[PDB]
User: Which sequence fits this backbone?
Protein backbone atom coordinates (compact mmCIF):
# COMPACT_ATOMS: atom_id res chain seq x y z
CA UNK A 1 0.00 0.00 0.00
CA UNK A 2 0.94 3.71 -0.01
CA UNK A 3 3.34 5.04 2.61
CA UNK A 4 2.33 8.37 4.09
CA UNK A 5 5.71 9.91 4.78
CA UNK A 6 5.41 13.48 5.93
CA UNK A 7 5.46 15.89 8.83
CA UNK A 8 2.39 17.50 10.40
CA UNK A 9 1.60 21.14 11.10
CA UNK A 10 3.27 22.36 14.27
CA UNK A 11 1.14 24.33 16.71
CA UNK A 12 2.38 27.93 17.34
CA UNK A 13 4.52 27.78 20.52
CA UNK A 14 5.63 31.29 21.44
CA UNK A 15 4.91 34.67 19.83
CA UNK A 16 5.88 33.94 16.25
CA UNK A 17 5.07 31.90 13.19
CA UNK A 18 6.43 29.50 10.61
CA UNK A 19 8.01 30.31 7.29
CA UNK A 20 7.17 27.73 4.64
CA UNK A 21 8.45 27.45 1.08
CA UNK A 22 5.99 26.68 -1.70
CA UNK A 23 2.93 27.72 0.29
CA UNK A 24 1.00 30.98 0.34
CA UNK A 25 -1.23 32.32 3.12
CA UNK A 26 -4.94 31.63 3.78
CA UNK A 27 -3.67 28.05 3.81
CA UNK A 28 -1.32 26.41 6.36
CA UNK A 29 -4.33 25.71 8.58
CA UNK A 30 -5.77 22.33 7.66
CA UNK A 31 -2.97 20.38 6.02
CA UNK A 32 -2.41 16.65 6.47
CA UNK A 33 1.29 16.11 5.86
CA UNK A 34 4.18 18.10 4.41
CA UNK A 35 6.25 16.35 1.68
CA UNK A 36 9.44 14.52 2.67
CA UNK A 37 12.42 16.90 2.79
CA UNK A 38 10.65 20.19 3.42
CA UNK A 39 12.52 22.94 5.22
CA UNK A 40 10.79 25.64 7.24
CA UNK A 41 11.92 28.64 9.27
CA UNK A 42 10.90 29.89 12.72
CA UNK A 43 10.08 33.59 12.53
CA UNK A 44 9.16 35.91 15.39
CA UNK A 45 5.76 37.47 15.74
CA UNK A 46 5.25 40.11 13.07
CA UNK A 47 8.40 41.02 11.20
CA UNK A 48 10.65 40.33 14.16
CA UNK A 49 13.77 38.23 13.65
CA UNK A 50 15.38 35.51 15.75
CA UNK A 51 18.96 34.40 16.23
CA UNK A 52 18.78 30.65 16.49
CA UNK A 53 19.43 27.43 14.55
CA UNK A 54 16.25 28.09 12.61
CA UNK A 55 16.00 25.29 10.08
CA UNK A 56 13.68 22.29 10.02
CA UNK A 57 13.98 19.55 7.43
CA UNK A 58 10.94 17.29 7.24
CA UNK A 59 11.89 13.62 7.59
CA UNK A 60 10.33 10.43 6.23
CA UNK A 61 8.59 10.11 9.60
CA UNK A 62 6.12 12.36 11.40
CA UNK A 63 8.71 14.71 12.86
CA UNK A 64 11.29 17.29 11.82
CA UNK A 65 15.11 17.15 12.07
CA UNK A 66 15.69 18.69 15.51
CA UNK A 67 12.34 19.39 17.10
CA UNK A 68 13.28 21.43 20.13
CA UNK A 69 14.60 24.90 19.40
CA UNK A 70 14.32 28.04 21.58
CA UNK A 71 14.34 30.81 18.99
CA UNK A 72 15.24 34.01 20.82
CA UNK A 73 13.45 36.97 19.27
CA UNK A 74 16.21 39.49 18.60
CA UNK A 75 16.09 42.65 16.51
Assistant:
Amino acid sequence: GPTSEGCQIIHPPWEGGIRYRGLTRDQVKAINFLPVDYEIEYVCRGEREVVGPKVRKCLANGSWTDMDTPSRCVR
